[PDB]
Amino acid sequence: HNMSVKAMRFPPKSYNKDLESAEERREREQQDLEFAKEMAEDDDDSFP
């Protein structure tokens, strides 16, 4: 049970070789939605 996890380690490693910080344009699109949301709530407040 220590042995076969210690060899199971390698399959996860090939996947980590695949990006695990990818889809940065999704996150940048969300960030461009939080500037529209921030001001959506200053306009639902209706307060400057």
Binding site: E38, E41, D42, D45, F47, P48
Partner: protein, 155 residues
């Protein structure tokens, strides 16, 4: 959650010191209170920042939560209370086992989207054989050492 606030002279803001209520604070951004913080942070008050002072004497005080010189290791549960525990678990092992075979035949003949959304009766999979073995074991191992240790300690 704990903030701090200080009102700001709204009059002086109207008079042109509106960009002059900026004292030099650091920052970290808030939102859900933008309700009254859009004229709060930016008209009526602002955000102070909070810290703490973790003394070492207070830390060595709170750190206390167990007086064990009569707890475990000088005790151990009842050995007829402890067999009635094993009985129950190691029977539940059987019940779960069967369903486990029936899951290993299924997963083989299906694609991971249908085993993904499989959230009806979580009693079937690994999750419960692990959930068990780590309570069972624990128990028992130590269940285990407690008896031995006392045999020498109070020899």
């Amino acid at each position: 959650v704990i903030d701090a606030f200080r009102l700001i002279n709204a009059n002086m803001m109207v008079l042109g010191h509106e960009p002059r209520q900026t004292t030099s604070n650091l920052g970290h951004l808030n939102k859900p209170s933008i309700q009254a913080l859009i004229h709060g942070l930016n008209r009526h008050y602002y955000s102070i920042t909070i810290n703490y002072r973790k003394n070492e004497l207070e830390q060595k005080m709170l750190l206390n939560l167990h007086k064990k010189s009569w707890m475990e290791g000088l005790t151990l549960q009842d050995y007829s209370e402890h067999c009635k525990h094993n009985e129950s678990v190691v029977k539940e092992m059987l019940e779960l086992a069967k369903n486990y075979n029936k899951a290993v035949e299924e997963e083989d003949k299906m694609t991971p989207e249908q085993l993904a959304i499989k959230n009806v009766g979580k009693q079937d999979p690994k999750r419960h054989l692990e959930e068990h073995v780590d309570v069972l074991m624990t128990s028992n191992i130590v269940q285990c050492l407690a008896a031995m240790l006392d045999t020498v300690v109070f020899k």
